[PDB]
Design a protein around this nucleic acid. Structure first.
Length: 187
DNA sequence: GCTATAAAAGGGCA
DNA sequence: TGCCCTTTTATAGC
């Protein structure tokens, strides 16, 4: 790992990317669910057609408005690439599908500092950013202000970082928290 | 399973 | 007017 960009020497692994794009045309969801083999639509439950492709492994939520949500990709590039594949399927189904305003909405990453954490102590010292009700959920919820990112910290040293729109925010949030986890290493 | 977290889309309903 | 709901993903205890 480049110790210069990642001083901790640990790089969070990207696990999930959520993006949206505007197909810029109205869609007939019922016609889409009928023609598209790997597409499901239950309006009474959710007003979108749920469609999936194997590569990049992702799930799309396609709306009558032409707007679309892409989930599951492991990278921003994989997410765009997946979103484009769905736009072409929709095009080939007979709709004038474009690719307007593609935007990465959320990036989810995770890593392991490989040492256990004293969550109770970190929670106490960082109370204005922490939420820890172990009887509820075993992880401490750390709502970082700069960058405005949320981290789920576990006793095992495993960390989830979410809410970023740029991978650098994910990286910086982790670099910020790293000395704090060290400060609260369970001995 | 399911507790929790972020985020987007849009229909239903209080 | 505005929350829930659906989907995804890591994490870990119920």
């Amino acid at each position: 790992v480049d110790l210069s960009k990642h001083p901790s020497g640990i790089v969070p692994t990207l696990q999930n990317i959520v993006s949206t794009v505007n197909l810029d045309c109205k869609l007939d969801l019922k016609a889409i669910a009928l023609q598209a083999r790997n597409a499901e639509y239950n309006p009474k439950r959710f007003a979108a057609v749920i469609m999936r492709i194997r590569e990049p492994k992702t799930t799309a939520l396609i709306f009558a408005s032409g707007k679309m949500v892409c989930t599951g990709a492991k990278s921003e590039d994989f997410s765009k690439m997946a979103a484009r594949k769905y736009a072409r399927i929709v095009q080939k189904l007979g709709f004038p599908a474009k690719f307007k305003d593609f935007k990465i909405q959320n990036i989810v990453g995770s890593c392991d500092v490989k040492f256990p954490i004293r969550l109770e102590g970190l929670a106490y010292s960082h109370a204005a950013f922490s939420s820890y009700e172990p009887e509820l959920f075993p992880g401490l919820i750390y709502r970082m202000k700069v960058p405005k990112i949320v981290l789920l910290i576990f006793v095992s040293g495993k960390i989830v970082i979410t809410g970023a729109k740029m991978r650098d925010e994910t990286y910086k949030a982790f670099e910020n928290i790293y000395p704090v986890l060290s400060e609260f290493r369970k001995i």
